[PDB]
Design a protein. Structure first.
Ligand code: CL
Ligand code: CL
Ligand code: CL
Ligand code: CL
Ligand code: CL
Ligand code: MN
Ligand code: MN
Ligand code: MN
Ligand code: MN
Ligand code: MN
Ligand code: MN
Ligand code: MN
Ligand code: MN
Ligand code: MN
Ligand code: MN
Lengths: 371, 371, 371, 371, 371
């Protein structure tokens, strides 16, 4: 069942969107709220099209309304971090992804980009590249997956993965609209597929260098939510939307450095993985917005997943925590895939943990300060 | 009853599809899954429009999710085989039909194109031409034919074949969209008609030379599934969707060589047919994805069909296994029609069997190796 | 689709029908209108329960409202002919079947009972017995048969005749209610069955002596219409409600005399049939309210019917105009079945024609006067 | 979705059924049609309540309308075999289960009772007792199980077997009505349970001696169909209504003789089973109306079933062809259960095969004549 | 939204239930399945009304279908434990609550009554009395509470507790039917009220002596499930059906001995409570079918609940783990209320834990063997 807003005449809205807007420009400021997994937005009018992110003014909002502050000093600040073209309003309107700061200009608790950028600047010469496979499930407003029988289940899994046809793929209109919307916005979207669970989908973001991975994925998530809002359905990043023999949603992260991409870079890939072998618990905590409880429902070691309590790595191992692609093993260079991160992970937390363990050789149960 | 996805606002999707996509190009990789009758697809982003099939990278997928592998080494490989223009995304986006290979680069079990291409290259000088009349039935998501009364039947057969009017043709919107989509994509689609069963239709693919017959028909099937997915109905290639006095769906194959097309080519047509007379059982096994059990429900010798257990040929014989058209008999040259193949046949299997029996003079119950 | 009246709360009506009515008695006067196939009724209050038909007063109605008169002298008269218990109002209320007379006390044009009674009194000593198998079709208010798919057809005929189950018998609630209502009223109803056409049914009336056959069948028809009115569906006696391979409705008439029932009564059965052989056209005109045009659609000689233009008789011959039952042939006594009469026949016309031809040895194209 | 007849006001019908019917009695004649699995019925009026089965007259019907005859001599004969009280019409109305005979008084092809009674009379002194567990599935008129999501599936099997609650048991109203209707009719119904498949149920018939097993089960099936017709749903005895991981429906047959019931009767139980071990193919053909093709879909050896191609017996073996109950093994006396027969089996065929193999020591592939 | 079974005509079922059943009697055998919280049932026919529980035969079922066994020896045994009058079938039909035993006659894992009865027999002279306040929530088949707005919430809590009116009490028809059904069955039901959460209700069972507390509550739960099944809604005993500011469901247990009920019995009440003070963790594990995880969602110390991690007792303390009623404090005698147990608790586990701690002075983390 789709939302009441989706039943409003879309024809009418278009007619208003066809009006020439004139000299004023709309900027939509996007930020992460106090849950560390929700996105918030609002719009301001600018006098002219900004040429770069530097021209965008800082803004503010009430943190007590976003689970981000309490009491008197609840005013929070928005500092623009990345700019994109607005696919919902078209050029010259912009999407402005912002960092959140408290009233005293300290980073907000869900502001993970502030530290993530400092870590990325530390290893800039090694040029870390990331890719994330964002899995998501389309849901009706009733909390049941989009397209599934009322209070019931479709046929067993098997035909839905990369499926085509009215009985195989549910809500491809949303997937096509999102893909185009991301390409128009300047998001580094690498592809899409239908997932094993019906009404479950995936888009790939990358390759992205350093802090660009978190910006591109967060804005790609925002566009998906905004596109799904137009169609009147919900995109969930819950790692296990439906209990039982229905696939979880993960965010598989591909990681490579300049050394790993160069000839005979497999030795550096293996060195990074054995470093990851010794910090499995540290990464599980970082790979989930609430410390790894959500990912416990997904990482059961059954549905092409690994076990949350046990670390494993191998070439072409779908069930392993870390997978080296078969081609990467043959070519002796390229990347490796971390399959642990949950679909509702913060990419700033995930990328920072990979750099700290693999590149800065950090150890122990707490992140190093100033290094 | 049409699917929940078909009830999403199509206006909205269009608005996103009207965005200029920019420099990136979408390629949809299409392959045959482990059932030998189902199609799978997913999309990747390319940096630029590929000029030919050679520029497309090889890709991969999980075979355990497509009924094509089990256990550890379930990664399969996609090798592009034919390129077409994407009618769902428009130029410069592409449809990429691929062959499937196992982890050790051996052909997949449902990869029949690999052997079919080798056979076609063997008889290239004789220039074999094919044409296939693909019959299909439109169905609602409930498994009942599109347009038929709820839990009931329309009037008896007689007015539906090539019918026009709301009470004669069911789901012509899908037929028109598919026809155009195929013409835009570069599929060699020769025409369409309404079939004797209401909601049953047919499109002709050809003439196609050698391996092009399987590529064009498989992609034409994919476009039909994708077009039907947009309208929220199902296209079935079941050889007998409805039991009783309702027509089956076949894939009648027209075959000719350079010798048969030349003046007094009827003698070569008759020589090919008498060779087919001695291998009826071998062809029945090849003409069906599960060895000829599905086609047993269609080949009953009643509804303009032949008997599955008996071979027959004649000029202008609709009830025969092989038909020589009346014009071909008069002109003493042209083609002959194999009416045996089921609607859910693999064209690679059908074309290969015709070349082996008629052109390579193969005998016995198993295909010759290396010849 | 059932009528708006059927959607009124039946619970409420019952509550009013549970009131004790007291000393006054309701009599429903029933008569045949000017179409010769429609029934009309209205109710009057009596001071007390009538002990016999003789105690019921004569009544009147406006003939211009029943297709039975025009101009100034349109008042018609109702003379009670047969009394029955009212199954819709229960004892002591009555159903009063009446003959219709013009303003000058001459019989109305659709009053066939007046002449039929005189003929029956002429052959009273021979004690003619009749039985009629009244076939009818239940229809929705839309003119489509009850239970059939909207604007469509059920499966082919074969499982519906005497069928049980939700997919075999349509509207058995009406059949059960009618059967009981007739038994309560004192109608000589001999049994029921589901017919070959789905939603088609039959009840048997008889054996009835002389004029009782027309009274019992006409009142049985009235009760069926009144019972169907309660359920909000229509009972049609159309001889061919649906064109094509769907069975017609007939009213098969069984006829025997005292001579035919006695030992070695087959010789008298054969003598009656050979007399019927010479008057096929006279009986076809009498067996239909509009001279035999309706029965032309049924008597096609295909669906267990005979040909309207040709007479035939035989033992156990379903396709014959006249059938001698196999048991009657073996026992050399009993009855014979006239299968010619249409479902919308007037039983007074049918019984009178059988007596005139078989017992009074009448010949020619017009009924004898005074004999 | 329930039938159009089920939407007619049941209140109204009751009001007519509350009328006192008077001196006339209704008898519903029930017989098996030409499919050997379908039941047919019709009603006649009797002058008085029959005291025993001997007082019921023989009747007849058209065999060409029941798949039981063709051409001229299509009249078939009904000979009453067992009488029961009518639960749909109440006392004194009767249900009359009849044998079918051709025009020349030879048994009809689906008349298996005629031979079954002769075999039972042969072993009368050994007093064979039978019990059958009739499994069935409730279905909507759309051919989907009653209560299941539209075009979908309920949760996996596990909670439905003997389940209580709106999410566990589907259509218990039908089960309760059938159970009572059978108890009122005088059917030897021993109990009911909810089956593993949701909307699937079972009733036990027995213990019944000799020919009474077929009469009681066939009439119990008729009452279920008639009760389901009232509720507007379909009872199917298809051995595998839904493909996949959904339980089949069987008719498990319990068999014991006077010797097997007596002290140390286990030796006679084992002797009967080893005789059954040598005739597995003969029994599989008899245990299915179409020679064992339907039961091939059920007897897969997976869902608490045995393999159709392999015979096995054991104590407390659910997966065996023949099961000796654990209590019977301990007490060294009682019965054994044949778990092979399909839900749509003819009990006359099943009981006759058990007596021929176990008691008459018949061998070979054809039944013995006159013994 | 109510179930498809609830939409079947209840009038029809009644008509069948009005048939006199005759000499045979129905017994419904009820048992606890392998989840320790679900109930299963099936029916058998008895020859006569059983006078006591001793006359009921032992029965059996397949444990592999009830989550209670696996592999070959999956047959389980039902031993009748308590008898009640059947409120769904009326006298003389019975409800038979049974204990479950394995194939080797050892108690089933969810058979807690076997040990509970032995403990109750040990302290029989002290005459322990119990009372349980069973809270439950009515839910639609969609998993949303009965009566709540579609995908939404009613007004805040405050008017629903003991509320009257269409906007205050949801599904009182079920509560009235259950209350009467329990009184007819012979269940010791002491009263009902509407709970603070709308669509949430409670019934009190008791006072019951020893093992009667578990029998009465389990059968009361079965009747509620069966009554809710008739109305087409679900009764859930989930301790927290809806997250947030919506009340949990508990099963508050009242406990008293002969000493506590006698004059100046408060000293024995205080001695029992201080013994309970030292075994808080042991009781939390016993008070929940899955070791206390479900009750963690309810025992938050906010909505009139206590904290799961902390024990507290006091006079008239709603927020305490143990409450002494104000009247009991004043009269210096009576009972105390354990407010810890979850709504889905097993009463056999709860009553046994209270007797072991308070009366048998058991200590440690495991129950004493043989004492
Ligand atoms: Cl905004
Ligand atoms: Cl895709
Ligand atoms: Cl009136
Ligand atoms: Cl009937
Ligand atoms: Cl039951
Ligand atoms: Mn994936
Ligand atoms: Mn991956
Ligand atoms: Mn065709
Ligand atoms: Mn053709
Ligand atoms: Mn008839
Ligand atoms: Mn007849
Ligand atoms: Mn069973
Ligand atoms: Mn059994
Ligand atoms: Mn309470
Ligand atoms: Mn309390």
């Amino acid at each position: 069942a789709t939302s009441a807003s989706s039943h409003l005449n879309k024809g009418i809205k278009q007619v208003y969107m066809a009006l020439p807007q004139g000299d004023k420009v709309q900027a939509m400021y996007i930020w992460i709220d106090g849950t560390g997994e929700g996105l918030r937005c609002k719009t301001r009018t600018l006098d002219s099209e900004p040429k770069c992110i530097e021209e965008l003014p800082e803004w503010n909002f009430d943190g007590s309304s976003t689970f981000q502050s309490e009491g008197s000093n609840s005013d929070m600040y928005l500092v623009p971090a990345a700019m994109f073209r607005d696919p919902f309003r078209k050029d010259p309107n912009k999407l402005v992804f912002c960092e959140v700061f408290k009233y005293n200009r300290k980073p907000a608790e869900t502001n993970l980009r502030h530290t993530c950028k400092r870590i990325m600047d530390m290893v800039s010469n090694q040029r870390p590249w990331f890719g994330m496979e964002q899995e998501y499930t389309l849901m009706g407003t009733d909390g049941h997956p989009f397209g599934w029988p009322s209070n019931g289940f479709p046929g067993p899994q098997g035909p839905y993965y990369c499926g085509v046809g009215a009985d195989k793929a549910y809500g491809r209109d949303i997937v096509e609209a999102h893909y185009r919307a991301c390409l128009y916005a300047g998001i580094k979207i690498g592809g899409t597929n239908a997932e094993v669970m019906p009404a479950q989908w995936e888009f790939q973001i990358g390759p992205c260098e350093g802090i660009d991975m978190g910006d591109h994925l967060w804005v790609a998530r925002f566009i998906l939510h905004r596109v799904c809002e137009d169609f009147g359905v919900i995109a969930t990043f819950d790692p296990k939307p439906i209990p039982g023999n229905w696939n979880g949603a993960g965010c598989h992260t591909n990681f490579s450095t300049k050394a790993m991409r160069e000839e005979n870079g497999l030795k550096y890939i293996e060195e990074a993985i054995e470093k990851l072998s010794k910090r499995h618990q540290y990464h599980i905590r970082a790979y989930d917005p609430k410390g790894g409880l959500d990912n416990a429902r997904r990482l059961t070691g059954f549905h092409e997943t690994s076990n949350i309590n046990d670390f494993s790595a191998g070439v072409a191992n779908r069930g392993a925590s870390i997978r080296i692609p078969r081609t990467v093993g043959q070519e002796k260079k390229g990347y490796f895939e971390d399959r642990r991160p949950s679909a509702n992970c913060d990419p700033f937390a995930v990328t920072e943990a990979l750099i700290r363990t693999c590149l800065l050789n950090e150890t122990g149960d707490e992140p190093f300060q100033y290094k």
